[PDB]
Amino acid sequence: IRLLVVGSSGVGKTTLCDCFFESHQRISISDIVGKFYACDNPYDGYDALVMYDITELKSFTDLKTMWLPDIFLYCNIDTQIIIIGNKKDQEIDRIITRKEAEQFAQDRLCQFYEISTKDDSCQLLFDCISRDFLQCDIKIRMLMVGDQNVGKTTFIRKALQTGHDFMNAITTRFEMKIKYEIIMIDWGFYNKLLQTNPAISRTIEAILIVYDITNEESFQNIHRKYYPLINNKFSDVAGKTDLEAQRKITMGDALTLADWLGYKYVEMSSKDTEDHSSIIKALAH
Ligand SMILES: Nc1nc2c(ncn2[C@@H]2O[C@H](COP(=O)(O)OP(=O)(O)OP(=O)(O)O)[C@@H](O)[C@H]2O)c(=O)[nH]1
């Protein structure tokens, strides 16, 4: 219900929530523009919207440059980022393609919608996010080791992904009755994120690393020893193995678990929701 609108000047918020005449006053709302040291506190009190012109290429290029680092850096693990093409009633005037705008919307882990401030659009978009507020609280971003074999098998419990021929970005929301949302990521998409936004692990809480029989886990750990050391952790077994003594030597850093195939009906549901639940309870204030 607490929102902030950013973006350069050819178009924007003024006209945008000028149509919030419709949505304003059940379900509540508040909207402010970003630009006192105490009044800089409600700045970060958002639940989330950086826009750009489809006509002005410069607005988009400055969404990719001028706007984003602030929004990524200061925002707490909470909220979420929505990227909005305005106009679209101007669609003849689009100099800015939808698929790479949405692709660079995907690669930053942001939601993306092209609207028209004039009519339609608007209230629809608003409606959507309103729903995703009572559909779920917000998201927890978890990462899962992306080595070749076992990942897909672990992820089958999402909706199977092929999709993302390079980097996964998977969604699962289940709980009990606060109904929260958990997003699984893969090791491929993390280093692919770091060229876009370095240290997005500020948004990452749980760390899952899977395994079958032979793996050192050294490299992946020590390269993940940087942005983490807050986190949360589990090592998993998948598939001369299933010996738990040499599991807990690397797991001396973490907690570990062992299972296989579709016996995971519990293990999945056991492991995830375990650490997940702690994310709610363990650190809160
Ligand atoms: N064609 C078209 N123009 C729009 C739309 N929404 C806003 N505008 C135009 O945007 C122009 C000025 O931008 P503003 O609406 O004031 O956006 P802002 O949030 O105040 O940000 P600034 O650009 O700094 O003023 C106005 O002339 C509006 O007509 C839209 O959906 N379609």
Query: In this structure, what token pair is assigned to residue 128?
Result: 């959507």
Domain ranges within the chain, ordered by starting residue = 1-138, 139-285
Q: CB atoms < 10 A from the CB of 113, how many?
A: 17
In angstroms, the CA 156 to CA 145 distance is 15
Which element (helix H / strand E) includes 3? strand 2-5
Question: Which residue minimizes the CA distance to atom 25 of ligand 1?
Answer: 9
Is 55 annotated as contributing to ligand binding? no
Please name the residue whose Cα sits nearest to atom 14 of ligand 1: 11
| Rounded distance from Cα 120 to ligand 1 centre (Å) | 16
Q: Residue of the nearest CA to atom 32 in ligand 1?
A: 87
Strands 139-144 and 50-52: unpaired
Say which amino acid occupies 88. Answer: K
- CA 37 to ligand 1 center in whole angstroms: 29
Q: Burial code of 28-55, b = ≥16 C-beta within 10 A, e = fewer?
A: eeebeeeeeeeeeeeeeebbbbbbbbbb
The Cα 272–Cα 274 span in angstroms is: 5
**CB-based contacts of 212, cutoff 8 Å, min separation 6:** 149, 150, 237, 238, 239, 241
Ligand 1 centre distance from Cα of residue 1 (Å):
23
Give the chain's count of helices (H) and strands (E).
Answer: 10, 11
Alpha helices in the chain, H assignment, sequence order:
13-16, 57-62, 68-74, 98-106, 123-135, 151-155, 187-194, 218-223, 247-250, 264-281
Ligand 1, CB within 6 Å, residue ranges: 9-15, 86-87, 89-90, 116-118
Give ∠ CA 71-140-135 in degrees, rounded to 5: 100
97 labeled binding residue: no
Structure tokens at 214: 């032979």
Per the entry, the structure determination technique was: X-ray
Closest CA to 72 of 53, 44, 102, 96: 44
- The span from the CA of 14 to the CA of 123, in Å, is 15
Q: Say how far residue 183 (Cα) sits from the centre of its chain.
A: 6
Among 15, 17, 58, which residue has the most ligand 1 atoms within 8 Å of its CB, making it the best to mutate? 15
Q: How many C-beta atoms surround the C-beta of residue 67 within 10 A?
A: 18
Phi first, then psi: what are they for 234, rounded to 5°? -150, 140
> Atom 26, ligand 1: which residue's CA is nearest?
11
> How does DSSP assign 82-149, residue by residue?
EEEE---SSGGG--S-HHHHHHHHHTTT-EEEE--SSSSSTHHHHHHHHHHHHH-S-EEEEEE---TT
Q: How far apart are CA 191 and CA 202, in angstroms?
A: 14
Q: Return d(Cα 162, Cα 158) in angstroms, integer.
A: 15
